[PDB]
Amino acid sequence: VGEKGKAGKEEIKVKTEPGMQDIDAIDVRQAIGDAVREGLNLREGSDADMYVNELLKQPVRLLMQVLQDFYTKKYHATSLSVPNLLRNALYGSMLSSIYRAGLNYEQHRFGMDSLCKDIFTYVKQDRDFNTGFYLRPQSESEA
């Protein structure tokens, strides 16, 4: 699908609601971009571009599981907390990488001090000190 400015090999579209017409199906990058931008609270910039690109680099199974879980939960909730709903979707797929790092994998332990421990564990695992706290996917390890 390219890199948001390239005429890619294929044009993939996603139906994010039940009964959506194939004609009115938004682009795959936009569907992922909607979750990242409205979930991680980002604007139109290189910060969101690298997140969505990294989600494209994920396996198709992992990509669809994030896509399916996020939008299926979103539709039921609307009948908001998009970051929370995305946190539900991001949790399941990015769960095996949590254990490889040492994150907080208990929802009851979703304490603000744990995130400080999590990020400190993250930046320690990232091995970058002056830029690790940016929470950028600049690492060379998929975890």
Contact 126, 132 (CB under 8 A): yes
102 DSSP assignment: T
Would you say 6 or 61 has its CB closer to ligand ATP?
61
The answer to whether 77 contacts a copy of itself (rule: CB under 8 A) is no
The answer to whether 64 contacts ligand ATP (rule: CB under 6 A) is yes
72 binds, among a copy of itself, ligand ATP, none (CB under 5 to 8 A by kind): a copy of itself
Q: Binders of a copy of itself: how many residues, by CB under 8 A? A: 30
Residue from 2, 92, 120, 133 binding a copy of itself (CB under 8 A) = 92
CA distance 111 to 135: 18
Helix, coil or strand: residue 107: coil
CA distance 136 to 47: 8
Residue from 41, 81, 97, 139 binding a copy of itself (CB under 8 A) = 97
CA distance 16 to 44: 21
- Which segment (58-66, 103-111, 113-121, 128-136) binds ligand ATP by CB under 6 A? 58-66
**Closest residue to bound ligand ATP by CB:** 61
Q: Which candidate, 76, 101, 102, 100, places its Cα nearest to that of 89?
A: 76
Task: Compute the least distance from the CB of residue 15 to ligand ATP, in Å.
Answer: 11
CA distance 39 to 30: 13
Residue from 25, 65, 123, 136 binding a copy of itself (CB under 8 A) = 65
The answer to whether 61 contacts ligand ATP (rule: CB under 6 A) is yes
